[PDB]
Design a protein around this nucleic acid. Structure first.
Lengths: 203, 122, 158, 86, 50, 118
RNA sequence: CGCGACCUCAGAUCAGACGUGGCGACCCGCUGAAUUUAAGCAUAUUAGUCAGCGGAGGAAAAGAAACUAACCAGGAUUCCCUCAGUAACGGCGAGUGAACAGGGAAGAGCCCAGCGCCGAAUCCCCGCCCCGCGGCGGGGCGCGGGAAAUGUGGCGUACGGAAG
């Protein structure tokens, strides 16, 4: 199959062939708007892995996210507190730029449902992501038992609740000794159990 | 004449609109009787006429919408008025057919490995 | 401020703890609910053991508990193989399978193989359409004498 | 002249009747409701005034649709059927 | 003022019709508690908002 | 073809009409501002009976959503009369009063007895 | 120059759908203080808490190991008891502070892409006919249209799988 040749080619990004392609596209993408529909997956291969099939109701939006950290939105750097919270410049955002991309796609396309997303290029000022979106109301998706899980109201706005692969990476969930702080559903659920007095009726 | 909604339903379309105006004029004449200042016997009748207008207008509207949802019965596209209004989220659910759909791979599991009725000795 | 000789002691009550005080007035209502949902489950599985499927004989890890034996997640694929039960058929006759369980020893294996031999012997299997028995089921005189087992099936005594 | 004499000059209104929330809070120059923020699609409600919330919530009004939903719920939202006639 | 909007004149219309005393048969009702209209509003005293 | 202008322009595409597979609402809404709904009652007031007996007018309390045009066709159709002009005011009470001046071949005082006001 | 393709991107009151706003006790994602404590105070504490923003559901989230262990080994998640005010953190001050094993409540497992085989074996929509449903579904009929080889469907997924 061709897809393994396309896979291992995309792993050689410093190669003359892919450096040219990643530069001529990362040029092309800058001259478009920050949130526009791609007519197909730029990487058909990667989209296959992430669950995109080539059938009606699968949509792909190329959305660019402005690049860098997160400086504190405080008038003239005046955080009126203790020197711990004086931080304004070198601060970082808890979610990746890819997760911020998935949710700019998912918010604008309020009707569609964000499946997953993949990198397609980075300038110094802009990262570019394709976001895989699905119509829960197209009969191709709505009559497929494989994909009628996104057609259920539990999976509205997965991007806004860190339920897409990119949003899950921000949450610090996972099994084992490194991920104790998110035992239970989440970081908040962990905190809740630990910071509750169980006052048993008898005790 | 005591107007009931049993000896309205069988009657004809323009036969009921005749009776509607026969009540409308009757009501407009009672509202003149209310202002010309007399007849407590007529000021009681004003409510009786108001309700009998409502009875006729209901049966007019009942028979329209019994006829429209007979017209739109066989069709694939019926107006938003005639479609089942329940909750919004309940209309958005998968159909009685779509929830019932299984993959070929899962129908094969159901056939090969059905959950058996068993019972173990102690 | 400390009075005299007393214990040096650090209450964890500096957070807004009164917002998150879990009381247990549910407790007897919970127990009634769990017991009604357990009886309701047991009635749905009319002949089948109420407790659920057989679990394997399992040594507890770490030196503190390795003198003890507890019920496992389910039988290893190699414990099922030697018994001669197909891993997808096992689950349909009420046998716990977890494919994660290795077998390092022959004793743990052979204990759990012999465990499944005992189960396959005791187990009365009803036909799928009840009106006509086929070759791979239990006899009709045994089917009438088949009724629920309460508590864990073949309980794992140390 | 900051008190009594200065109250005389009060003769032109900043707020008028908002046309979501009905309250005399629709600032004519800002063209925003101080109560509900009308041109903003979402309701102006804040969690720091639990009292201000409970003045304007689902209980407050009629619930002319939402009261019959509660009534229509307890028969599984049945449609297009009548009770059996005389 | 003399110059009004239609919206305000409908507001002022409702407030006039609410400013009438209770009918003298309302207190002859079985479970009567109302003695007089408490929500009356004079044009010197209470200034109706705006 | 040569570009006469140095501007590109969105070329005037063909845009079709609505030919819907069903009407959104099943029935056309019935008119609720009728001839009877518009005219509520006449004023039988000192000021309004002089208005009948002098100016050859009728005075009606009318639905507040009404034109002068709707009142003219309403006063005509219900009282088989013709109207010279309609003046309207919305009262402080909130209801619209109509001063329906009648054409000079009809006495207001001889039609005011027919509707039944005295 | 013209005509047929394709790609990329426009316009429609185009045919049919879909989203917004509310509630917000519980739940998910961010953002995020200072009172306060330290007998002052800045790190710490309060506290990832209040306020702020977004998104839900009848529960949510989590979830079938890139696990725990170091045993004679356990075996998804969640929850309760216990571990335990413990290991550890900390102007090592004030204070903070989990996990495993163990007993129980419940208990359920699975699916792709890739790899390859099968003539796209696949799916969507319009028109007709016959059932037929206030959860538009079933069966006929058509060089009817379309998506799809820039990869649809069946088999198959680490417990190995396939072919003969």
């Amino acid at each position: 199959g061709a897809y393994k040749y396309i896979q291992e080619l995309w792993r050689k990004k410093q190669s003359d062939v892919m450096r040219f392609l990643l530069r001529v596209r990362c040029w092309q993408y800058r001259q478009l708007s920050a949130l526009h529909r791609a007519p197909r997956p730029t990487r058909p291969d990667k989209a296959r892995r992430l669950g995109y099939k080539a059938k009606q109701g699968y949509v792909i939006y190329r959305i660019r996210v402005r690049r860098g950290g997160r400086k504190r939105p405080v008038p003239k750097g005046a955080t009126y507190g203790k020197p711990v919270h004086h931080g304004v410049n070198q601060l970082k955002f808890a979610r990746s730029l890819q997760s911020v991309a998935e949710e700019r796609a998912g918010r604008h396309c309020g009707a569609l449902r964000v499946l997953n997303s993949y990198w397609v290029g980075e300038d110094s000022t802009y990262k570019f992501f394709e976001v895989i979106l699905i119509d829960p109301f197209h009969k191709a998706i709505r009559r497929n038992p494989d994909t009628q899980w996104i057609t259920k109201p539990v999976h509205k706005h997965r991007e806004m609740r860190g339920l897409t692969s990119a949003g899950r990476k921000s949450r610090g969930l996972g099994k084992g000794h490194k991920f104790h702080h998110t035992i239970g559903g989440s970081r908040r659920a962990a905190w809740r159990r630990r910071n509750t007095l169980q006052l048993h009726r008898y005790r | 004449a005591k107007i009931k909604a049993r000896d309205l339903r069988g009657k004809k379309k323009e036969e009921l609109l005749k009776q509607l105006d026969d009540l409308k004029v009757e009501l407009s004449q009672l509202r003149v009787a209310k202002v010309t200042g007399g007849a407590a016997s007529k000021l009681s009748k004003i409510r009786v006429v108001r309700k009998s207008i409502a009875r006729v207008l209901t049966v007019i509207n009942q028979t329209q919408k019994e006829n429209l949802r007979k017209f739109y019965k066989g069709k694939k596209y019926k107006p938003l008025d005639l479609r089942p209004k329940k909750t919004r989220a309940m209309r958005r659910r998968l159909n009685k057919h779509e929830e019932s759909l299984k993959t070929k791979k899962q129908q094969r599991k159901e056939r090969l490995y059905p959950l058996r009725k068993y019972a173990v000795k102690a | 401020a400390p009075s005299r000789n007393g214990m040096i002691l650090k209450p964890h009550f500096h957070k807004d703890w009164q917002r998150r005080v879990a009381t247990w007035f549910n407790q007897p209502a919970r127990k009634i609910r769990r017991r009604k949902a357990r009886q309701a489950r047991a009635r749905r599985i009319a002949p089948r053991p109420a407790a659920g499927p057989i679990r394997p004989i399992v040594r507890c890890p770490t030196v503190r508990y390795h003198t003890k034996v507890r019920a496992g997640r389910g039988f290893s694929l190699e414990e099922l193989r030697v018994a001669g039960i197909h891993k997808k058929v096992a689950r349909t006759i009420g046998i716990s399978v977890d494919p994660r369980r290795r077998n390092k020893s022959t004793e743990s294996l052979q204990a759990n193989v012999q465990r499944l031999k005992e189960y396959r012997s005791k187990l009365v299997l009803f036909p799928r359409k009840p009106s006509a028995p086929k070759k791979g089921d239990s006899s009709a005189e045994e089917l009438k004498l088949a009724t629920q087992l309460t508590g864990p099936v073949m309980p794992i005594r140390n | 002249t900051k008190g009594t004499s200065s109250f005389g000059k009060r003769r032109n209104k900043t707020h008028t009747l908002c046309r979501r929330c009905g309250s005399k809070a629709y600032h004519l120059q800002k063209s925003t409701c101080g109560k509900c923020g009308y041109p903003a699609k979402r309701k102006r409600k804040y969690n720091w005034s639990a009292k201000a919330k409970r003045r304007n919530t689902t209980g407050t009004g009629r619930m002319r649709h939402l009261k019959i939903v509660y009534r229509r719920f307890r028969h599984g939202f049945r449609e297009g059927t009548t009770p059996k006639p005389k | 003022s003399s110059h009004k909007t239609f919206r305000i004149k409908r507001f002022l219309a409702k407030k006039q019709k609410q400013n009438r005393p209770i009918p003298q048969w309302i207190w002859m009702k079985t479970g009567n508690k109302i003695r007089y209209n408490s929500k009356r509003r004079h044009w010197r005293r209470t200034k109706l908002g705006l | 073809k040569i570009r006469t202008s140095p501007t590109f322009r969105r070329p005037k595409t063909l845009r079709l009409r609505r030919q819907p597979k069903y009407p959104r609402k099943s029935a056309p809404r019935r008119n609720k501002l009728d001839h009877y709904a518009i005219i509520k009652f006449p004023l039988t007031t000192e000021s309004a009976m002089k208005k009948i007996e002098d100016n050859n007018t009728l005075v009606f309390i009318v639905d507040v959503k009404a034109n002068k045009h709707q009142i003219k066709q309403a006063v005509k159709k219900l009282y088989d009369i013709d109207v010279a002009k309609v003046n309207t005011l919305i009262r402080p009470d909130g209801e619209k009063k109509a001063y329906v001046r009648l054409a000079p071949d009809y006495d207001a005082l001889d039609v005011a007895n027919k509707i039944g006001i005295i």
